[PDB]
Amino acid sequence: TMKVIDPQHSDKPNVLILGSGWGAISFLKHIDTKKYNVSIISPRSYFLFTPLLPSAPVGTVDEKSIIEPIVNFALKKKGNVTYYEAEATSINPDRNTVTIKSLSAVSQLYQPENHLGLHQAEPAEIKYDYLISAVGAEPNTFGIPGVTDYGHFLKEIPNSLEIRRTFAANLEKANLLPKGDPERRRLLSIVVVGGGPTGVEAAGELQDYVHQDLRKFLPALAEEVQIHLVEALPIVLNMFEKKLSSYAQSHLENTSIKVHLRTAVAKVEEKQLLAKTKHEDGKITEETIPYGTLIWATGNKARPVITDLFKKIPEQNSSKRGLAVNDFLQVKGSNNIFAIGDNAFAGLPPTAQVAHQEAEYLAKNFDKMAQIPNFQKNLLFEENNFKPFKYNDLGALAYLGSERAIATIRSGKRTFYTGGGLMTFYLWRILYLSMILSARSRLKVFFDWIKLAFFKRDFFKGL
Amino acid sequence: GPTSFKTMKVIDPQHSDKPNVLILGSGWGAISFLKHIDTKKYNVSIISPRSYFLFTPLLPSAPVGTVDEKSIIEPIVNFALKKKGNVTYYEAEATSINPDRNTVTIKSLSAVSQLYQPENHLGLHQAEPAEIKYDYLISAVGAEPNTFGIPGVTDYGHFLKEIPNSLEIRRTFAANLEKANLLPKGDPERRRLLSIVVVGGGPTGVEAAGELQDYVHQDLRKFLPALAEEVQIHLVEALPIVLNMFEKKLSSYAQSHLENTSIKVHLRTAVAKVEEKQLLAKTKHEDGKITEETIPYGTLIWATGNKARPVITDLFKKIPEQNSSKRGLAVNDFLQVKGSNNIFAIGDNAFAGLPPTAQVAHQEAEYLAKNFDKMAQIPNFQKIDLLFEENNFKPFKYNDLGALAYLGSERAIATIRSGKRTFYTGGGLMTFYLWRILYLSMILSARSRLKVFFDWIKLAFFKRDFFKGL
Ligand SMILES: Cc1cc2nc3c(=O)[nH]c(=O)nc-3n(C[C@H](O)[C@H](O)[C@H](O)COP(=O)(O)OP(=O)(O)OC[C@H]3O[C@@H](n4cnc5c(N)ncnc54)[C@H](O)[C@@H]3O)c2cc1C
Ligand SMILES: Cc1cc2nc3c(=O)[nH]c(=O)nc-3n(C[C@H](O)[C@H](O)[C@H](O)COP(=O)(O)OP(=O)(O)OC[C@H]3O[C@@H](n4cnc5c(N)ncnc54)[C@H](O)[C@@H]3O)c2cc1C
Ligand SMILES: [Mg+2]
Ligand SMILES: [Mg+2]
Ligand SMILES: [Mg+2]
Numbered sequence: 001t002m003k004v005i006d007p008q009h010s011d012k013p014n015v016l017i018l019g020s021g022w023g024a025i026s027f028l029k030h031i032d033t034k035k036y037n038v039s040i041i042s043p044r045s046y047f048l049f050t051p052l053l054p055s056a057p058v059g060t061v062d063e064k065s066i067i068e069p070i071v072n073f074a075l076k077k078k079g080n081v082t083y084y085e086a087e088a089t090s091i092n093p094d095r096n097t098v099t100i101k102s103l104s105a106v107s108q109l110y111q112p113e114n115h116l117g118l119h120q121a122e123p124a125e126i127k128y129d130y131l132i133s134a135v136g137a138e139p140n141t142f143g144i145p146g147v148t149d150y151g152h153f154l155k156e157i158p159n160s161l162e163i164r165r166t167f168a169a170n171l172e173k174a175n176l177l178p179k180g181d182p183e184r185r186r187l188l189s190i191v192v193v194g195g196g197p198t199g200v201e202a203a204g205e206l207q208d209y210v211h212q213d214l215r216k217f218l219p220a221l222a223e224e225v226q227i228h229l230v231e232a233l234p235i236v237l238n239m240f241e242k243k244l245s246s247y248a249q250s251h252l253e254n255t256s257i258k259v260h261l262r263t264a265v266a267k268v269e270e271k272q273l274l275a276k277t278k279h280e281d282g283k284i285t286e287e288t289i290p291y292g293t294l295i296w297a298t299g300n301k302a303r304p305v306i307t308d309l310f311k312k313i314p315e316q317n318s319s320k321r322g323l324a325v326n327d328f329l330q331v332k333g334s335n336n337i338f339a340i341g342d343n344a345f346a347g348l349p350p351t352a353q354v355a356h357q358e359a360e361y362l363a364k365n366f367d368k369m370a371q372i373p374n375f376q377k378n379l380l381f382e383e384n385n386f387k388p389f390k391y392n393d394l395g396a397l398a399y400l401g402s403e404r405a406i407a408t409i410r411s412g413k414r415t416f417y418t419g420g421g422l423m424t425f426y427l428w429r430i431l432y433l434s435m436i437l438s439a440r441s442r443l444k445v446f447f448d449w450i451k452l453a454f455f456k457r458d459f460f461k462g463l
Numbered sequence: 464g465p466t467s468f469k470t471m472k473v474i475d476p477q478h479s480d481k482p483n484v485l486i487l488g489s490g491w492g493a494i495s496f497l498k499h500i501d502t503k504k505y506n507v508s509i510i511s512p513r514s515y516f517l518f519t520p521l522l523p524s525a526p527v528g529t530v531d532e533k534s535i536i537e538p539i540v541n542f543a544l545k546k547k548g549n550v551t552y553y554e555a556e557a558t559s560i561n562p563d564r565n566t567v568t569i570k571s572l573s574a575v576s577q578l579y580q581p582e583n584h585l586g587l588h589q590a591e592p593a594e595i596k597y598d599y600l601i602s603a604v605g606a607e608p609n610t611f612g613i614p615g616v617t618d619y620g621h622f623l624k625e626i627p628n629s630l631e632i633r634r635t636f637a638a639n640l641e642k643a644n645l646l647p648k649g650d651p652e653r654r655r656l657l658s659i660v661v662v663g664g665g666p667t668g669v670e671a672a673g674e675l676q677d678y679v680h681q682d683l684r685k686f687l688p689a690l691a692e693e694v695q696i697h698l699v700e701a702l703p704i705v706l707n708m709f710e711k712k713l714s715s716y717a718q719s720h721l722e723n724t725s726i727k728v729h730l731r732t733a734v735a736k737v738e739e740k741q742l743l744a745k746t747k748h749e750d751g752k753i754t755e756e757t758i759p760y761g762t763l764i765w766a767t768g769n770k771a772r773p774v775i776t777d778l779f780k781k782i783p784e785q786n787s788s789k790r791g792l793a794v795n796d797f798l799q800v801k802g803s804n805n806i807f808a809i810g811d812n813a814f815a816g817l818p819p820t821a822q823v824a825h826q827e828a829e830y831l832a833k834n835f836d837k838m839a840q841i842p843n844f845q846k847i848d849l850l851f852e853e854n855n856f857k858p859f860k861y862n863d864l865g866a867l868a869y870l871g872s873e874r875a876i877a878t879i880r881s882g883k884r885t886f887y888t889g890g891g892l893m894t895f896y897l898w899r900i901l902y903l904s905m906i907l908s909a910r911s912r913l914k915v916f917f918d919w920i921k922l923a924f925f926k927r928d929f930f931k932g933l
């Protein structure tokens with residue numbers, strides 16, 4: 001016997017959102033809670049502004065500054081929003097329910113607050129009239145041994161804390177060791193795997209901490225740290241014009257970062273890893289790299305609750321990366337479930353930028369559906385001349401450490417800005433600050449950057 | 464046996480002629496001292512297991528995010544950087560003070576930071592014991608929370624002394640709110656989970672309760688009004704009045720206000736024992752009779768006095784003049800540990816008849832540092848207790864500057880004075896603004912001061928950050 005939550009107080013349809021990230025929150029911001037009853041299931045009680053996560057480990061920004069509680073977005077809604085802090089473990093399409101487990105809390109932001117009768121660590125099924133799936137994707141080790149055990153992903157707030165604690169602990173042991181000790185040099189050694197903007201910014205941020213703050217009180221130690229940027233492709237930041245990639249690499253190397261291109265990690269052990277380089281000519285070299293801190297910033301794979309769903313919907317069996325959706329962001333094989341963000345595959349890159357646009361688009365569709373009597377009761381999309389989702393690539397930005405960035409801003413076929421440099425770094429800051437989804441988070445990031453102009457970064461081992 | 468290889472690494476810097484001053488701790492005493500000590504005349508080293516200074520008077524507002532944990536601490540290294548000479552910081556714990564050989568034993572060594580060029584390799588290892596040699600010792604390790612022998616307080620309650628306590632209190636209460644809200648209204652377990660007991664009617668307990676009541680009334684109530692209405696905060700105090708260091712009328716003003724905010728105050732009440740989900744409170748009434756009440760609670764905050772640390776009580780036994788000590792090291796007019804001519808003690812680890820406050824610790828420190836300025840001009844100092852009388856050093860003289868207490872809901876009481884003169888004494892709205900301005904001014908670092916300021920500004924626009932595990 002499973003507890004089934006199925007709210008039929010009003011005729012408003014029950015919209016059930018999975019997740020509290022870019023897709024789910026952008027959707028929540030735009031959905032009409034006067035026309036729809038909205039519920040959210042996510043094990044993370046806050047929205048995470050991912051593009052600034054790479055600057056959290058070293059305190060360029062603080063962890064709290066870049067997150068925003070779901071409840072704060074929920075308060076600004078006019079209707080009834082319920083937030084289940086729990087994890088969706090099974091999507092059950094044929095009975096229109098989602099199974100949740102690891103239930104920690106339930107928050108009903110409205111008057112009635114009918115007692116639901118759920119208990120922590122007790123399974124349950126939430127019923128829905130529409131499902132919006134946005135659970136994202138999870139880090140992909142690519143089958144490389146040791147990465148889970150010995151490295152750190154850069155995906156969630158706890159990763160920021162773990163990275164800081166590992167590196168801080170390493171600096172402390174290293175400094176006790178005599179200069180010239182290879183163990184000391186290992187402990188001051190950082191490997192970042194992934195040459196996309198995330199890996200690049202992580203390395204640039206760590207290099208900034210070392211050069212700007214650490215060096216103020218432990219210059220010799222700071223001089224010995226070596227940061228390594230490992231990338232499997234022939235260039236870093238390959239979504240950018242090649243000349244910007246070249247600018248970025250030269251700058252990174254100028255800040256003393258070592259870049260290993262055409263290089264892949266073959267295996268990871270506790271104190272060292274094996275890197276193989278596939279040269280242009282075709283030969284393969286390998287290097288054992290001792291490291292103290294390994295940051296794994298690359299690849300993402302479908303979550304288990306999503307790959308399980310693949311098997312329950314015939315049209316979805318051939319899916320591998322994410323849920324196949326139609327022009328309308330409807331999961332194929334379903335007329336009830338929509339998917340947006342990294343958990344959907346529609347040919348688009350996996351970015352917040354795409355997730356945010358899908359969401360705003362879908363929410364607007366939900367405005368139209370609520371004016372068409374048939375949708376409530378009962379192809380409807382084609383018939384009512386809904387327009388397909390159309391992604392508008394607005395561009396890309398990457399911080400490179402030491403107050404330089406690259407950026408390309410566009411819309412449609414028009415490029416409005418494309419280059420790198422000092423001013424580009426100020427643009428990076430302004431643009432990111434303007435993309436943040438909440439006034440509070442925006443103010444906190446702003447205060448963090450102001451403090452940074454006067455004082456060193458907070459780098460507390462365990463705080 | 465006498466054949467033992469017993470070998471202990473001993474750090475004895477004899478590079479320069481400057482005397483080695485060794486400071487124990489990184490709190491009010493140690494840091495105020497560090498700020499004033501002349502590092503051109505003296506070589507300074509610091510031993511403390513805490514790598515940062517903690518601005519204690521704002522700790523009670525950390526658990527609920529009125530101010531953030533990071534905002535009220537400042538890394539030792541930041542104070543050390545502003546010094547002109549050589550400062551070394553041992554992140555480790557002093558476990559034995561060895562007066563007859565002028566050394567301090569350290570353990571749990573995590574790190575050593577030498578903020579100067581030579582940086583001679585010392586050859587220490589983590590989790591390896593060592594002894595640091597000194598020409599002068601400044602002991603300021605403070606005091607630790609006292610459970611008074613009451614069973615269960617350590618196991619089931621939370622102290623309010625250090626940053627980790629702030630985190631634990633938040634996590635306990637936040638977890639309780641979540642469980643409580645799943646329970647149906649009227650369930651006694653729900654009512655227990657929303658129940659908070661603060662033991663200690665001094666400014667620390669009062670502010671802790673006031674801050675929690677603020678979080679509940681201002682922020683929690685915004686999104687969970689029914690839950691917020693059900694929380695009950697209890698202030699338990701063994702004396703007949705709260706805040707007994709204040710004028711009695713201010714105490715009465717404070718209690719009435721606390722009770723207005725819905726805090727329940729139990730005076731003349733002492734906790735006899737603490738179990739996991741409940742505690743036993745006994746009230747000794749004026750007439751002489753004793754009543755007892757079992758109080759179910761979800762969160763217990765224990766803010767009542769402290770006691771001497773083990774490394775201090777061990778020292779009691781090694782110095783004949785100090786055997787009769789119980790609360791702290793007995794010092795003379797010059798803050799010299801009696802029975803010693805080498806060791807000075809300031810802060811809560813010393814007993815000189817003064818109250819145990821940051822206010823006293825800070826003044827002892829500035830005073831001692833100034834003495835060290837004088838000693839460095841008198842060739843002979845380079846026995847000692849006489850030199851002080853002889854060279855007409857003045858005894859330490861504490862100047863009580865007053866007291867403040869925040870009471871929740873933007874009210875405070877305060878009495879500001881100097882000597883026999885009272886410059887301010889009362890309570891209310893403006894007193895709360897004074898509380899803020901005065902505390903902001905008392906903070907020891909520009910960084911911490913800016914962060915607290917930003918925290919209070921954010922507070923005017925947004926709810927407090929109350930993350931269960933962050
Ligand atoms: C460090 C970093 C930096 C990035 N920088 C950029 C950038 O600069 N520009 C850009 O365009 N993109 C950037 N991205 C990519 C962007 O973050 C993702 O594409 C975006 O997260 C996709 O949005 P989403 O809603 O699909 O998933 P997410 O934002 O990851 O949200 C997923 C949500 O689902 C929740 N969840 C997980 N499992 C379950 C479950 N079983 N049940 C219910 N909920 C669950 C998660 O807790 C989370 O709340 C960055 C990503 C990272 C990691
Ligand atoms: C919550 C709270 C609020 C307070 N509010 C006020 C107030 O508003 N006004 C006021 O006047 N007073 C206040 N106080 C009291 C004030 O904080 C203390 O009197 C002050 O700490 C005494 O200074 P100290 O240097 O002796 O000890 P502390 O400031 O506590 O410093 C002790 C230092 O010693 C370190 N240490 C501990 N053990 C060892 C060891 N074995 N070896 C080396 N180092 C060690 C500790 O880490 C710490 O760094 C408050 C105290 C608390 C707990
Ligand atoms: Mg999402
Ligand atoms: Mg997110
Ligand atoms: Mg509302």
Ligand SMILES: [Mg+2]
Nearest residue numbers: 134136341343
């Ligand atoms: Mg998704």
Ligand SMILES: [Mg+2]
Nearest residue numbers: 136137138342
């Ligand atoms: Mg994702």
Ligand SMILES: [Mg+2]
Nearest residue numbers: 166292293294
């Ligand atoms: Mg490691």
Ligand SMILES: [Mg+2]
Nearest residue numbers: 488490493603
């Ligand atoms: Mg101290």
Ligand SMILES: [Mg+2]
Nearest residue numbers: 490491516517
């Ligand atoms: Mg302190």
Ligand SMILES: [Mg+2]
Nearest residue numbers: 605606607811
């Ligand atoms: Mg103390």
Ligand SMILES: [Mg+2]
Nearest residue numbers: 603605810812
């Ligand atoms: Mg002391």
